[PDB]
Amino acid sequence: NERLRALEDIEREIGAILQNAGTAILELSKEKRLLDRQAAAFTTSVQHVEAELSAQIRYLTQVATGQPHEGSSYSSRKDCQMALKRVDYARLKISDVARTCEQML
C-alpha cells in the first residue's frame, strides 16, 4: 500500500530533480544569482532519488521463487455469488406472490 505511493513519489521527485537540474544549468549558463543554490538543490535531489531507488531495489525480496499469495479467497467470492443469487430468487418469488395477490384483490 505505502510502497506504491513511495515509488510514485520517488518517480515524481526524480522527474522534478531532472527539471531542476536543467533549469539550474540554464540559469547558470545564461549569464553571469541563485545558480549555486539551485545547482546544490538539484544535486541533492538527484542523490536523494538515487538513494530512494537503491533502497526500493534493496527490498526484502518476498518470494522470488514461485507464484506467491496463491488463492484470492475464491470460496468467499462464490459464497457471496450464491447469496446474491438467493436474494434474487427470493425477490422474484416475492414479486410473483405480489402479482398473484394483486390479481386476487
78: cell is: 462464490
- In the chain, the largest separation of any two C-alpha atoms, in whole Å, equals 97
Crossing angle for the helix pair 35-57 and 2-30, nearest 10 degrees? 150
Asked if residue 96 binds another protein (CB under 8 A), the reply is yes
Output the CA torsion 21→23→24→30 (10° steps). Answer: 140
Give the side-chain half-sphere CA count within 13 A for 32: 7
Interface of this chain with another protein, residues 68 to 87, rule: CB under 8 A: 86
Least distance CB 48 / another protein (angstroms): 54
Those residues with Cβ within 8 angstroms of residue 28's Cβ, 6 or more apart along the chain or in another chain: 35, 38, 39
Asked if 94 is part of the footprint of another protein (rule: CB under 8 A), the reply reads yes
Q: Does 89 bind another protein (CB under 8 A)?
A: yes
> Is residue 100 within the footprint of another protein (CB under 8 A)?
yes
Smallest distance from another protein to CB 80, Å: 12
Residue 7 touches another protein, criterion: CB under 8 A: no
97 binds another protein (CB under 8 A): yes
Kindly list the residues in this chain that would bind another protein in the complex (CB under 8 A).
86, 89-90, 93-94, 96-97, 100-101, 103-104
